[PDB]
Design a protein around this ligand. Structure first.
Ligand SMILES: *[C@@H]1O[C@H](CO)[C@@H](O[C@@H]2O[C@H](CO)[C@@H](O[C@@H]3O[C@H](CO)[C@@H](O)[C@H](O)[C@@H]3O)[C@H](O)[C@H]2NC(C)=O)[C@H](O)[C@H]1NC(C)=O
Ligand SMILES: *[C@@H]1O[C@H](CO)[C@@H](O[C@@H]2O[C@H](CO)[C@@H](O[C@@H]3O[C@H](CO)[C@@H](O)[C@H](O)[C@@H]3O)[C@H](O)[C@H]2NC(C)=O)[C@H](O)[C@H]1NC(C)=O
Ligand SMILES: *[C@@H]1O[C@H](CO)[C@@H](O)[C@H](O)[C@H]1NC(C)=O
Ligand SMILES: *[C@@H]1O[C@H](CO)[C@@H](O)[C@H](O)[C@H]1NC(C)=O
Lengths: 859, 859
């Protein structure tokens, strides 16, 4: 079944996008824009608009290539690629866009019918306000006719979309053929003009002051329109009429006439000034204000023209509105859409110059076909007659109204059916065939509200603002998801670079703000509220709570993004696991551990406090909760910011061995284990106490985590007291110098150890080390003095450990904190007593020792 | 030492804030603003500005009360309360504010000296541009004089701050005394006025056309300024002079004169229009343009006046610029600041009305004291003479320039010394006494750049924009931190409600945008870039990487915020721990477990995959890494989004018992354990396999987590196949109905089980349950059909289990998935074989069973 609807890029995405870009503006307003802007600035307008739409086409193609393309419309693709939040924001902004587009197209069909086809038939008789009322009443009647048609029989609309496109394309080819024929044989459309004041020709017949009748020089009607005598019997004619001259100016000069040089400059005359051709002669007298003087119909400006013109390039999201019936979506969609935009941009940029170079510089600024005997201005450039265009534009515009009144409610019911936003659930209701019955009424209501502003020139900025907001979000989600390395964002496109999407976002964000700085802020705040509300509803949906669940989702997303990345880090920073030992009273046997951990991390970073409770889990559940509360209160008391984890284990050694390798969620692991020294290991008769510490040392070294064994921790300073002056005597014995040097710094960054100095008692070869140590300190911009002491089984170890004792006390007996590198545990577990004796003698005579062992790739 | 500087709220925060709010604007521009705006709109201006500054005072007091107040300036308080990011953004915005304030005050001192004190002495001779050049050259000389003074001898500035405040206050009291005296005896300052055209009086002497000299009616000088004869010998006088009349209008009418009714309306005349008193008579002839006509000096508007006036209310952050020397900061600072703002607001609102009701409606719009013989306009309202004000304002304004050139570089070196932003490190360099030597040069450079725009009227909007951005960030950080329940945000204030800070943020965000929509966007983007760069640098500082560390910090902060909250949730949602069993080959023995977990959670939520590796950790480190990679590849293959944790344990039972209670970081815990059924427990000779499952059941029940034992999992559908039609036969046997009912729904929300139906085979009492079940389904808006089957040691259990088998197969033999409530494990571990036999018979004849046991507070 799918294969038959399979369509090549052309018939699948080119024609829908081509049929939806070609709107009414190209006819009813391109000539006016060219005239009041000058070909140069008109070129700037068309190019800037086409640039936003092209960069946005590139971003949307990047979205199209990423991942499998869902079978729904463009909304489903955008949703599945940018998350439901962006999906809903773009859905609603594009939907309001489509509704106000149905409003503009209905206004256009009414304007064409009323001004050009049948002027005589009007609700309000002959003045501007009357047109507005005529448009309001005529607009709603057509609006009601459109709603009823779309409600009953959309299949007929599907059938005649092709005829509508036919009408559009025939009209454009007629325009081009007329422009070409205007080189040798241009048409005979003349305009009466009085001096440099252009006259209307709806009522005048001859551009002559006196129309000879039956061999009698009776004054012509124009005399009757500038002089009230009408018989030239001592007629009182006004100043400008008597002074200046009426002339018949060829309204469409040849393509070779060279008028482009004349109309190459802006006019921008404000409301009610008479349109003046700055070529013909003129007197200077003034005061004779008359009705016949063609007037500037709106106080124009550049920023107004860009807004009036932008809704003619919107519609590229329709390229992928037929994405279910495609063969190679990620291959057909980008090329088809970009080619469609290139074609339409080529048409606009060619027609701008052709109008500039073929139509008089006065007939262009005429926004209602006056002075050309009431014919469509662009219609005058056509091969058969202006009638072909005046009817083709009307049929195309009513067809586009039907198209957008079928396309908007389907999108609304799809956004409702997705249950992204709850309150729109009412509009999810569908007809027997799945047509949105109760959404359509809302679309009609909003289109009604639009039509009430019965002027294209005032509806166009609103439509443009909504579509511009849609494009801005579509560009921003891609730029963001590319920068932040969002999961599942693989934009498999040969030309998509995040700078492109960012440049598009910036350009037509500027466009938004240019057109209106207050509508743009209103749109941005509406979109932000919808976005945050969708995020909140999703949180409440998945986690169960609003703000609790919001933070929960934030954490999960951060950890996932954190998972798909390089394991190492360019710098090494100690993330602690504090091993608190719980006594038989279930009280922390060493709070100084937490005090010191707090001082070491200085309240920032990750600190996981782990502890083992000896016993059976089946019956110590309550004790585990109580002891967890105890440790949490202790953490809060020592200003430790972090998390607590208790394991009720059968064996203390096994509990710690499981904590050391299972703590932390993946990606938020610790990398150092901070332990308390087993004070009084020899004193206790039981050998388990000292053997457990060794077991932990082996487990820590094997897991490749750093180890900081703090000894004599009962004498460690509390968070409230301070040191006036003291020396952190780092002993860089042998290797593992990175952690040893880095530690004291981190300690000195805290207020307790802030006021102390640092002395590295490194142990000719040392002098080689002296130069390296000096470089390390010179770079770190820290006040540190390095002194190099030249330094050169069990009996030998003791005989040398006593020398180490001698030197360390002789240099550092009165130090406030002695860091000290550690030796590894024995391979054979028999020599553990000898190993602990080595440590005890090595650390004898020291008030505060922090034994440190690297065992890792520390840099 | 601290006690002596202890100052009560008045002398500690009132006088610094009072001395820093009273600027130059109050003199040189309040009269002009009142005149060109009308007392009404001037009142609107003063009230709106004072409203932003008052709500911001409330927010800053809320900041002041929260936590301990650091000893530094306001920057340190703001930093320690809003994080270094907001601290740095506000610091730089307020610093640029202070520099451009030094620029405005130097411009003001020059303007006062040059226009009012010594007009004759000017660099450029007599025209507007000449004043600008005079101001540029004069400004830099004073600027260089100020820099040298501040560089050498700030102690003298500290000494004379009191004299500067004295000058300000004496001036304001002189203004009020003059206003009062103007009730009975107003002063004699007359103005010559020709018709309704006001004349300048710098050069005229008598307001008379002819000045009689020596009994001869020679024409007066004004004749020479409107007629070139100067001898009235057939003098050719212009039109307006001959038609209209010169009159002497009292320039300061009495307070009782009632002119307020006259000057109660806006003027807003654009540049160069002659200032006209709309009271006196006038002819209508025009054309006689003359030099003497006093002209509107700037194309005024409301939005311009608000910008010109705002830099007179800035300075409230100086209230807490002396926070180290206070007694009760959180008590003195709020009251002192708010009282200071009330005092100054009271002064402005009184002087607006007094000027409205005492000065002619023409002398006010005169921005350079013309027509009053070149005297300060407000100076004319004073008891002794205008000289007292003209000198007091000059001394006050040079004093404020010195004050802001000492206050800006100190703040800059403090922001540098904090090492928040790296590249500013160069400016951290200080003098011997700690004065910023190399920061001051930059402050002077920026002040120089400001002075180059030699006009207060153009510097004031920039200053106002910077201070407005500072206040907006100070309000937004408080509103945000109050809403999101940010840790350590305890605003102990009796009147602070987040709606107040939000209203302040909105009001003067509107102020920002009103004054300039392009400067405001430039300021916002600058602040956003500084904020994100500070955040990035902090990330790189603490975690070691830029983007890795950024996501790491985001995760830690989310979990912490997640920690201080209610433990339960209004809704229950299953967060899974999938227990994968690793075989002797270290391969996942049941991938269907992951398949089903993926289907159950549907890719959203938290899924922690735990598994135990039997062995010793010291030597299976490599195996643990390999098996972790294996399980990660498996997770990615089954579209499971989540984390993996392996524990190398000595006993499989103990490894699982430790995983069940230690998985997840605090706050991101699981709440359900998903296990695979021990298929073939009887077949295996070893009893360990079945006994371990029971051990896990007891541990799961005791930990109060839900349990989902999936049986016959080898037949569970894969993620690619689907079910055309089928029945999820939920058996709500007895209790724990919330989880049982909730599960199938979550399953049906996935595409695999999307196309299946649901049948609840609940087991008169049931009919009571029928009504409850119907209500539960009616609310959930899900298509579900409920059928109620009426239903009524070891031998009895088997004799009834076979009945359960009979019924369940008779109803559901051909079901696609049979959910089934579970019975608890025996209390005595001897009956475990009987317990497992009960389960096996109860589940006999079923292709797919999901045994479910609640054991928790599920709602
Ligand atoms: C149609 O003819 C009228 C009749 O003069 C044109 O009006 C006048 O055009 C001049 C341009 O030369 C405008 O500027 C004037 O320029 C002279 C040059 O010296 C200067 O002396 C004047 O003071 C003035 O600036 C003038 O404002 C304008 N109106 C009047 C009342 O003179 C009109 O511009 C012609 N149409 C077009 C499209 O040019
Ligand atoms: C100072 O005196 C001059 C001399 O007339 C005033 O100029 C003229 O004031 C009138 C206000 O009445 C302006 O509006 C005119 O109103 C009449 C009312 O019918 C209307 O017929 C006119 O068409 C016009 O709209 C007028 O524009 C203005 N200028 C001229 C050239 O007449 C001037 O307003 C006086 N100063 C003040 C502060 O009022
Ligand atoms: C009107 O026409 C006459 C003769 O055709 C010519 O001399 C005159 O200059 C024209 N008027 C103007 C304003 O050029
Ligand atoms: C000028 O003064 C004369 C007499 O003092 C008076 O009649 C005339 O109305 C005055 N001019 C105007 C414009 O009122």
């Amino acid at each position: 079944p799918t294969k038959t609807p399979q369509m090549g890029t052309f018939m699948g995405v080119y024609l829908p996008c081509l049929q939806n870009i070609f709107g009414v503006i190209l006819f009813l307003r391109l000539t006016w824009v060219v005239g009041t802007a000058g070909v140069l600035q008109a070129f700037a307008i068309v190019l800037i608009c086409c640039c936003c739409t092209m960069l946005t086409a590139i971003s949307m193609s990047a979205i199209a290539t990423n991942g499998v393309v869902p079978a729904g419309g463009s909304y489903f693709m955008i949703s599945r690629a940018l998350g439901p939040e962006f999906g809903g924001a773009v859905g609603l902004c594009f939907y309001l866009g489509t509704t106000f587009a149905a409003a503009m197209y209905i206004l256009g069909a009414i304007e064409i019918f009323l001004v050009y086809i049948v002027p005589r038939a009007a609700i309000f008789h002959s003045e501007s306000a009357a047109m507005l009322n005529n448009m309001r009443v005529y607009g709603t009647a057509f609006l009601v006719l459109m709603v009823l048609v779309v409600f009953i029989g959309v299949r007929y609309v599907n059938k005649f979309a092709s005829l509508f496109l036919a009408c559009v394309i025939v009209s454009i080819l007629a325009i081009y053929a007329g422009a070409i024929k205007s080189s040798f044989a241009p048409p005979h459309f003349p305009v009466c003009m009085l001096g440099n004041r252009t006259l209307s020709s709806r009522h005048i017949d001859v551009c002559s002051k006196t129309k000879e009748i039956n061999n009698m020089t009776v004054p012509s009607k124009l005399w009757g329109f500038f002089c009230n005598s009408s018989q030239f019997f001592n007629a009182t004619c006004d100043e400008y009429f008597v002074h200046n001259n009426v002339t018949s100016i060829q309204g469409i000069p040849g393509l070779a006439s060279g008028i482009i040089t004349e109309n190459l400059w802006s006019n921008y005359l404000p409301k009610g000034e008479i349109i003046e051709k700055p070529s013909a002669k003129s007197s200077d007298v003034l005061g004779s204000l008359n009705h016949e003087y063609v007037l500037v119909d709106i106080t124009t400006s550049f920023t107004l023209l860009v807004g009036i013109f932008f809704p003619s390039v919107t519609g590229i999201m329709a390229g992928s509105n037929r994405s279910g019936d495609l063969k190679d979506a990620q291959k057909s969609i980008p090329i088809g859409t970009i080619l469609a935009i290139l074609t339409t941009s080529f048409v606009y940029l060619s027609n701008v110059v052709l109008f500039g170079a073929c139509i008089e510089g006065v007939v262009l600024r005429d926004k209602f076909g006056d002075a050309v005997k009431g014919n469509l201005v662009v219609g005058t450039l056509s091969w058969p007659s202006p009638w072909v265009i005046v009817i083709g534009s009307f049929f195309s515009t009513c067809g586009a109204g039907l198209q957008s009144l079928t396309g908007a409610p389907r999108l609304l019911q799809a956004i409702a059916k997705d249950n992204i936003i709850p309150f729109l659930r009412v509009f999810g209701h569908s007809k027997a065939n799945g047509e949105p019955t109760w959404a359509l009424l809302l679309t009609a209501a909003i289109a009604e509200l639009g039509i009430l502003i019965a002027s294209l020139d005032l509806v166009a900025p609103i439509l443009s603002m909504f579509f511009l907001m849609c494009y801005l979000f579509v560009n921003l989600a891609c730029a963001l998801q590319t920068l932040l390395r969002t999961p599942n964002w693989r934009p498999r496109f040969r030309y998509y670079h995040w700078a492109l999407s960012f440049m598009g976002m910036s350009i037509c964000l500027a466009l938004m703000f240019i057109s209106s700085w207050y509508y743009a802020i209103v749109a941005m705040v509406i979109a932000g509220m919808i976005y945050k509300y969708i995020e909140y509803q999703g949180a409440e949906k998945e986690w169960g709570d609003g703000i609790r669940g919001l933070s929960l989702s934030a954490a999960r997303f951060a950890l996932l993004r954190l998972e798909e990345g390089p394991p190492h880090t360019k710098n090494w920073r100690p993330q602690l696991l504090v091993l608190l030992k719980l006594d038989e009273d279930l009280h922390v046997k060493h709070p100084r551990l937490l005090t010191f951990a707090s001082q070491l991390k200085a309240g920032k970073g990750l600190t996981i406090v782990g502890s083992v409770i000896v016993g059976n889990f089946l019956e110590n559940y309550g004790e585990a909760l109580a002891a967890e509360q105890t440790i949490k209160h202790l953490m809060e008391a020592e200003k430790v910011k972090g998390f607590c984890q208790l394991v009720v284990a059968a064996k203390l050694r096994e509990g710690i061995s499981h904590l050391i390798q299972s703590c932390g969620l993946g990606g938020m692991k610790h990398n150092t284990v901070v332990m308390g020294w087993p004070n009084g290991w020899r004193q206790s008769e039981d050998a388990r106490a000292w053997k457990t510490f060794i077991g932990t040392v082996r487990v820590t070294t094997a897991a490749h985590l750093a180890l900081l064994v703090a000894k004599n921790i009962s004498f460690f300073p509390s968070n409230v007291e301070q040191f006036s002056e003291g020396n952190i005597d780092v002993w860089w014995i042998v290797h593992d110098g990175g952690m040893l040097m880095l530690l004291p710094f981190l300690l000195k960054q805290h207020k307790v150890w802030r006021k102390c100095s640092i002395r590295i008692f490194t142990v000719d070869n040392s002098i080689q080390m002296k130069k390296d140590l000096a470089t390390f300190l010179y770079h770190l911009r820290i006040e540190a003095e390095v002194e190099v002491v030249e330094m050169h089984s069990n009996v030998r170890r003791m005989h040398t450990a006593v020398k180490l004792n001698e030197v360390i006390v002789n240099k550092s007996h009165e130090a406030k904190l002695v860091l000290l590198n550690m030796p590894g545990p024995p391979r054979n577990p028999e020599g553990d007593e000898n190993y602990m004796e080595f440590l005890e003698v090595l650390t004898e005579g020291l008030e505060r020792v922090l034994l440190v062992r690297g065992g890792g790739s520390e840099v």
